[PDB]
Design a protein around this ligand. Structure first.
Ligand SMILES: O=C1C[C@H](c2ccccc2)c2ccc(O)cc2N1
Ligand SMILES: O=C1C[C@H](c2ccccc2)c2ccc(O)cc2N1
Ligand SMILES: O=C1C[C@H](c2ccccc2)c2ccc(O)cc2N1
Ligand SMILES: O=C1C[C@H](c2ccccc2)c2ccc(O)cc2N1
Ligand SMILES: O=C1C[C@H](c2ccccc2)c2ccc(O)cc2N1
Ligand SMILES: O=C1C[C@H](c2ccccc2)c2ccc(O)cc2N1
Lengths: 219, 219, 219, 219, 219, 219
């Protein structure tokens, strides 16, 4: 990554064994459960595009996902190039060239060029731009591997309400409902999919009940 | 987080793999037992709002709790906005804008803006303000998942007094009795809920007995 | 804690995940065996009162002990207040207020105030003062949970002398004999509680035998 | 490795126990699965040639591979010497000599000489040059140990499409297909090797289907 | 311990969780096998007397040994006091007092006083002086717990020579033979205690055989 | 070890718990398999002679080897003394004395003297000189414990060629064949010791076949 030293200048630092191991292990253990994404984001704090490729490349399984990811990155790169075409021909000697899509994705740029962009005044944030494309791709993957429609999360006759809600919001998260839909469903689908005894209790609370109030009600 | 370097200026540092892992593991292992809260607080020492979202977002289970938490945070944010309304319209060029509720919660502010607020002279402590809202929400969750009323913690006929007290104060902690009530119960409910042999011993000690004195008495 | 940087000024540092985990694990694994105390002391090297509460609060079991501890801390605080009463009324603007008992224990003081006291010239060592109260309380707990009187540590007919001595001094340590009594018992209770064959060997060595000499004798 | 300190000068640092252990463990656990290569590259960030030999030499098994690697390194070294012959005879006193192939590979150069080259202005990047030769050799090894031709990866009658794709792209990666061939096969061999039910679904989508579209189609 | 910072002044640093844990674990796992001693020495690199007490005090078992250790430390302290008596009466204001035995052992000196002595120009090396006393005591313990006389290490009829030698020198190390005796026994007791077939082979090599030569001979 | 700080002066640093543990564990797990040597070398990067003794002394088993090692070190020391005799009599006040063999091996020199030599301008590299003697000794040990002659590594009738080569070069490495012999055997003993089916395939390839070519041939 690029970090501030103890004296406040922005410099490159090797990606650490702990970072490298953390990411590989979270993928091994969690696959593409939605919480992997914010872990990815945090593990790649200050990453260069080189570092982001490193992390992605160190993944051994899930090659279908990695290939889908590549496709997403290629799509974003191509859009970047549509918006920000670069001058063909020789670079001004000693000067910084403009990044293309593939430069941002780290496949046609050097670490040195990446460092130059990221520490320019002002910075051309190639790491942050690439991380956004990657996360966009990872979110498609999370949705793809979400095994269950919210429509099939229904409370079991002896299933504690709490356990049901946990299933319900876990599914909505993977299915990638917006936060509006998540805040909203408390008044609707959550109640509909509840079991008969809880549904009656909830129906009776009236509208505007918090999730806390619903969960207390059916405890 | 934001930290002082070795030279005393306040700078941003990436959240560490060790921090990230610690929090995820404490939630996996302890759920919402009350001691998770002070662990959360300590793991988020110097956190930006970004870091606080990171920690919360890396949690994979307990989505009912996470949704309740969101609701609590939205309530606090809305109160913040009631107290501290912000000027609509364009920002003074190069100047610091005032934070809204959602800015404090990190959903509408950048890391850069968060850093600007937290390192201003004097600091606008958005991380500390958000951490308070979060802890408020986590405390509601701890109380919600507390499985047992203090009324049902009664000493078993062969249960060592010590083991009973441990159950009793563990329950009071989750049920979230004030410290007055915790200091107070030594003279009352603790004695009432004791078994017959210990109750008689304790009844006889008289009032004003320390907890130490009670435990020695029924050892 | 408060630490010297690489440039020799005293600054606050976040308590580390490793510290936090170490303490929680030592309590889980050792409970209140006497060696937990010096581990506590070393893990809290340079702690603020905030850090000391953190460590104590992260403990999930042993709530009877934690409540006894609170009682001890309240007793010390009340004595502090007897010795060092503080001026009622408004603080001199921009100046440092004097700490009360509860300020030392971290329940009514901020981290900022704690830092101010601890880094004042000369320091008002609120962390060290509070750690003493805590250790005083933890020592009462160690004595309370010591399961065995020294009177009941007697050498078994086939128990190697060494194993007996280990039991004997382990018990004395938990029972909290002074170092005089520990140095002294080599001439008395240690011999009395030895088995018949070793007792005769030891009786015959005469007075002034080192522990080394006793153990060699009954090897 | 060679690193920038906190003050921006390039200095040698001992290879860490964590780095050393990470590499040994990744080889023990993954052998020459393709993801070992980018892990090697990242673990050797800033390595001198000495460090690169260290890592390779600490490997205990896989000696056939290590000997093949040596052969590849000797081939590259010999080509380096063809391109960059060095002056025979005595070195200019106090001056830097030019590196030969074996100097780059660390077998005939000292750590001091390596440091001199790598921190020269401009740097003679002997570590980076050697790492390229090594990776070239490791890629030959990955291809050699790839146990399965892409032609034999065919979807099973009850094998979920996703699991099939994962096998398919895992194999292509080890077999070392170019990225063109990887992007291309989505329209061809991937479809041909699919089972009858999925093949029909895919045949019907038409050309230009993304991998995402194929996987959704056969979900 | 006391360490040099990044700027070359000698300062106190908290003993680390890793150090604390390392020592406790080596004692748990190895007891007083002789290799514990050099581990102790290395783990206490730069220790103050406070740190040395910490390490010793964190040990939970082996209290017979810890009490023997105390006795040894008291003996050394008393000898220190014989050699270096200190002036009774009030200290010169603001000046450094001379250490007594108990000051060196950390029981009557503060951390501040210890730091003052150890960082004086020239240093009064109280940590190093105390570590010597401790090691002296630990060596007595290693000898005490050495379970086997060298006289009873004899090569078994089917025991490989190598395995026998390993037993032999392991025993000599615990029994604490000087290095002369260790270098010497190769010509004597090692041969005598060998089995009949190896003894004849060795007898025939003649005098002056290296240990390497003996081991090759009986391989 | 001796390290450069963040400001470029050469200073002593305590050997770390991680280093100490790494070495002990590699010996426990790998004994004297040849890859232990380069691990030793890397773990002792920047070691003083004190540090090198520490590492060797922390080893608990393998005392036959440790005694052989001592003998090798004594031989080298005695040769050092033959080449570099030192002036008898009193040292020039405040000046640096010349190291003897035993000074280099750390048995008659202090840490201070070692630091003085290693940080002199120019350095008298006592750590590097001693590490060479140690490695010389460790290589004798690796050869001694190599359980199998290369002559007895023959490919089994159903043993995959790859597995055979791995055995073959593992054995050659422990037996300590030169790199000439390792590069050479591909044309000879490797083929001779191959099974009948592979031998014929290899015989037919002709001379000058790479190891890669041989392994592809018999795959
Ligand atoms: O090595 C790479 C880096 C990056 C990558 C790697 C592993 C998984 C996902 C994407 C990538 C992105 C787009 C592309 O066309 C090719 C590549 N190849
Ligand atoms: O991503 C977030 C951050 C934060 C959060 C995350 C995980 C659990 C709990 C709260 C949050 C808070 C309020 C809100 O309306 C939305 C969010 N969404
Ligand atoms: O949170 C705290 C901190 C401290 C504490 C915590 C956990 C166990 C023991 C003592 C404490 C001390 C005295 C008191 O009256 C109240 C408290 N409450
Ligand atoms: O020790 C070495 C370093 C390097 C190496 C080591 C372990 C595996 C692979 C290559 C190497 C490269 C070429 C060569 O002819 C000899 C060597 N010997
Ligand atoms: O706490 C201590 C420190 C030291 C110590 C501790 C644990 C084991 C061994 C010795 C010690 C040394 C001599 C003495 O008389 C008393 C003590 N008490
Ligand atoms: O303590 C030591 C250090 C060194 C050492 C230790 C452990 C194994 C091997 C050699 C050593 C070297 C030569 C010698 O005559 C004596 C010693 N004794």
């Amino acid at each position: 990554p690029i970090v501030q030293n103890l004296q406040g200048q922005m410099v490159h630092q090797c990606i650490s064994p702990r970072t490298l191991n953390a990411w590989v292990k979270v993928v091994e253990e969690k696959a593409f459960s939605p919480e992997v994404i914010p872990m990815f984001s945090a593990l790649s704090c200050g990453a260069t595009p080189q570092d982001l490729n490193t992390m992605l490349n160190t993944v051994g399984g899930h090659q279908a996902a990695m290939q889908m990811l590549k496709e997403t990155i290629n799509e974003e790169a191509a859009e970047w190039d549509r918006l920000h075409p670069v001058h063909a021909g020789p670079i001004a000697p000693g000067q910084m060239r403009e990044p293309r899509g593939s430069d941002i994705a780290g496949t046609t740029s050097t670490l040195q060029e990446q460092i130059g962009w990221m520490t320019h005044n002002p910075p051309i944030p190639v790491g942050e731009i690439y991380k956004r494309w990657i996360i966009l791709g990872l979110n498609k993957i999370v949705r793809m591997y979400s095994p269950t429609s919210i429509l099939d999360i229904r409370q079991g006759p002896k299933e504690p309400f709490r356990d049901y809600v946990d299933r319900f919001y876990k599914t909505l998260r993977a299915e990638q409902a917006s936060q509006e839909v998540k805040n909203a469903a408390t008044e609707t689908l959550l109640v509909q999919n509840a079991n008969p005894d809880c549904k009656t209790i909830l129906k009776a609370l009236g509208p505007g009940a918090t999730l806390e109030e619903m969960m207390t009600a059916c405890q």
